[PDB]
């Protein structure tokens, strides 16, 4: 099979198969999400209240996430500031 | 099979298969998320209240996450500041 | 099988399979998330209230996480400051 990702025979759910091949990427990558799996029965081969949680909160005014910023020059300031000339 | 990720035979759920191959990446990568698995029965081969939790909180004004910033030059300041000339 | 990650036969849930191959990466990588597994029955081969917790809190004004910053030059300051010329 030489190179082969996610090779299988039979049954059973398969979820979340990711193949990344980068050549001089120079960038941000974000993989995220929640997975839930269950197998029952399986004869001849009780309910649980639950929840998976991956949220977020928080209040701001300047928020940068998974971004690329480039500000080259003079007086490159991030956030509040005060510049007075003469 | 030479090179083979996630090779299997039979049953059972498979979740979260990630293959990363980078050549001179020079960048940020973020993998995140919660997984829950359960197997029952399996004959001839009680409910539990639960929850998985991966959240976040906090308040700010300048927030940078998983980013790439480049500010080259004079007077490169991050945060509050005060610059007076003459 | 030469090179083979996650090779198996039979049953049972499989979660969180990660393959990283970097050549001159020069970057940040973040893997995170909570996993819960349970196996019951298995004949012929009591509920527990629980929770897994991986959150975070804290308040700031300048917050940088999993980022790449490069500020080359004169007067490169991170945080509050005060610069007076003449």
UniProtKB/Swiss-Prot annotation, chains A, B, C:
Its cofactor is Cu cation; Zn(2+). Cu cation binds at residue 85. Its main location: cytoplasm. Keywords: Acetylation, Amyotrophic lateral sclerosis, Antioxidant, Copper, Cytoplasm, Disease variant, Disulfide bond, Lipoprotein, Metal-binding, Neurodegeneration, Nucleus, Oxidoreductase, Palmitate, Phosphoprotein, Ubl conjugation, Zinc. The modification Phosphoserine is found at residues 63, 67, 70, 72. Changing residue 43 to R: In ALS1; reduces structural stability and enzyme activity; increases tendency to form fibrillar aggregates. It is found in: Cytoplasm; Nucleus. Changing residue 45 to C: In ALS1; slow progression. The keyword Nucleotide-binding does not apply. There is a cross-link at residue 32 (1-(tryptophan-3-yl)-tryptophan (Trp-Trp) (interchain with W-33)). Changing residue 50 to R: In ALS1; ubiquitinated by RNF19A; interferes with zinc-binding; ubiquitinated by MARCHF5; leading to the degradation of mitochondrial SOD1. GO terms for biological process: action potential initiation; anterograde axonal transport; apoptotic process; auditory receptor cell stereocilium organization; cellular response to ATP; cellular response to cadmium ion; cellular response to potassium ion; determination of adult lifespan. It catalyses: 2 superoxide + 2 H(+) = H2O2 + O2. GO terms for cellular component: axon cytoplasm; cytoplasm; cytoplasmic vesicle; cytosol; dendrite cytoplasm; dense core granule; extracellular exosome; extracellular region. Its EC number is 1.15.1.1. Binds 1 copper ion per subunit. Binds 1 zinc ion per subunit. One of its GO terms (molecular function) is zinc ion binding. The keyword Lipoprotein applies. Homodimer; non-disulfide-linked. Homodimerization may take place via the ditryptophan cross-link at Trp-32. Heterodimer with SOD1. The heterodimer CCS:SOD1 interacts with SLC31A1; this heterotrimer is Cu(1+)-mediated and its maintenance is regulated through SOD1 activation. Interacts with DAOA; the interaction is direct. It is linked to Amyotrophic lateral sclerosis 1: A neurodegenerative disorder affecting upper motor neurons in the brain and lower motor neurons in the brain stem and spinal cord, resulting in fatal paralysis. Sensory abnormalities are absent. The pathologic hallmarks of the disease include pallor of the corticospinal tract due to loss of motor neurons, presence of ubiquitin-positive inclusions within surviving motor neurons, and deposition of pathologic aggregates. The etiology of amyotrophic lateral sclerosis is likely to be multifactorial, involving both genetic and environmental factors. Spastic tetraplegia and axial hypotonia, progressive: An autosomal recessive, neurologic disorder characterized by loss of motor abilities in the first year of life, after which severe, progressive spastic tetraparesis develops. Affected individuals have severe axial hypotonia, hyperekplexia, hypertonia, and myokymia, reflecting upper motor neuron involvement. Cognitive development may be affected. Belongs to the Cu-Zn superoxide dismutase family. The protein (both wild-type and ALS1 variants) has a tendency to form fibrillar aggregates in the absence of the intramolecular disulfide bond or of bound zinc ions. These aggregates may have cytotoxic effects. Zinc binding promotes dimerization and stabilizes the native form. Destroys radicals which are normally produced within the cells and which are toxic to biological systems. This is Superoxide dismutase [Cu-Zn]. The gene is SOD1. The chain holds residues 2 to 122 of 154 of the full protein.
